[PDB]
Structure formats: C-alpha cells, structure tokens
Design a protein around this ligand. Sequence first.
Ligand code: ZN
Ligand code: ZN
Lengths: 48, 49, 48
Amino acid sequence: NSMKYTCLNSEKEFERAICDMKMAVNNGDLSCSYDHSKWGPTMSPALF
Amino acid sequence: LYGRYNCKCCWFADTNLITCNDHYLCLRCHQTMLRNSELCHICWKPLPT
Amino acid sequence: LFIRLLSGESDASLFFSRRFKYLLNVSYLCHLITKETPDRLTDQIKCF
Ligand SMILES: [Zn+2]
Ligand SMILES: [Zn+2]
C-alpha cells in the first residue's frame, strides 16, 4: 500500500491501469499481456 | 485528432485511406458499405461522397 | 464455426469486431457446464 504501481487491493490503480490500457489500444501502442505458469508451486521463501 | 490511420473495419489496410469524419475507412470497405445502404454502420453517420 | 467465421482470402474481415465478439462469446460457452468435481477421490489424487 505504500507502493503505487501494484493493483491487487487498490481499485484506484486498477481503474488507472484500465484507462491507460484503453488509451493505448485506441492510440496503437504495444500491449503485452503476460501470464506466468506455475507461480505458486515454483516460488520459495528463500527468495523472499 | 483522428484515429491511428486504420480502416477500423479490417484493421490491416492503411493505404490512401478516406476519412468518415471519425476514422480512416479504406476504399473497398467504403465502396461495399455504400453499395449496401446509405448508412455507415461503423460510425452511424452519413457516408461521404 | 471458427473456420467459417475466420477463413477467407480477401473479404474475410469486413466487420472484424462483430466476428471477434461472436467468437469470444462462443469460446466462453464453457461457463454453461457446471464445475462440481465429477469425482472427489480422483480430483484429490490429481491435486496431490
Ligand atoms: Zn478495409
Ligand atoms: Zn464511418
């Protein structure tokens, strides 16, 4: 919550990302949707 | 300012396009939609001549 | 259905927004079939 760009428990940043994506699609920027495989069973507490 | 210089109907034709007062409709799509009826069906405005 | 809507050489994208919306709603028909774990033991085994 001290951070800004992350949008998981902040609807304001979610709406900001939504309108930015809409404006980029209307203007023609490079949109890349990256889904990651095995996010859960791969991470380790040692990394954190 | 108009759109991003695209047909807005096929998305893949950007060559000497024609403005429909809102976009950059191409030639063949314009001719087809003019032969169809008098409306534009993509901006709901009177088609140009 | 996907071929009949997508195939074509030149006049296959006269109205691509409608085609994309139709194909998306067709692909989203999976929500009609319910999700009530056809078998519990097999699902637990597969989860393990
Ligand atoms: Zn076109
Ligand atoms: Zn138009």
